[PDB]
Amino acid sequence: SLGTIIIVDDNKGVLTAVQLLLKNHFSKVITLSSPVSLSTVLREENPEVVLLDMNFTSNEGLFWLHEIKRQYRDLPVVLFTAYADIDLAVRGIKEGASDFVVKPWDNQKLLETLLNAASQA
Secondary structure, eight states: OOOEEEEEOSOHHHHHHHHHHHTTTSSEEEEEOOHHHHHHHHHHSOEEEEEEETTTTOOOHHHHHHHHHHHOTTOOEEEEEEGGGHHHHHHHHHTTOOEEEEESOOHHHHHHHHHHHHTOO
């Protein structure tokens, strides 16, 4: 089955859109823009995947990828990247991100990337 996904983004509209897109696939969709909130939900909510804004808190996405992986080594993290940041998304993959999705996104590709990230052996 598919449990919880956490979406981390500075842009409340992106959170609104992604929640709407993913609401009916995952059991729970948690959206947030706070580092403090992120720490609580990672501990308590047994997430299956995190979708992480490349520019979160713009130290940005790569910093947060690292900190999440430090504590939750097996939690897939997918970076959500503007085209202007694709070099940093590629560096993210090198540094252990599970995948990335570029913005503006394709709705079906976004879902598929997240399901696949949450469905690795």
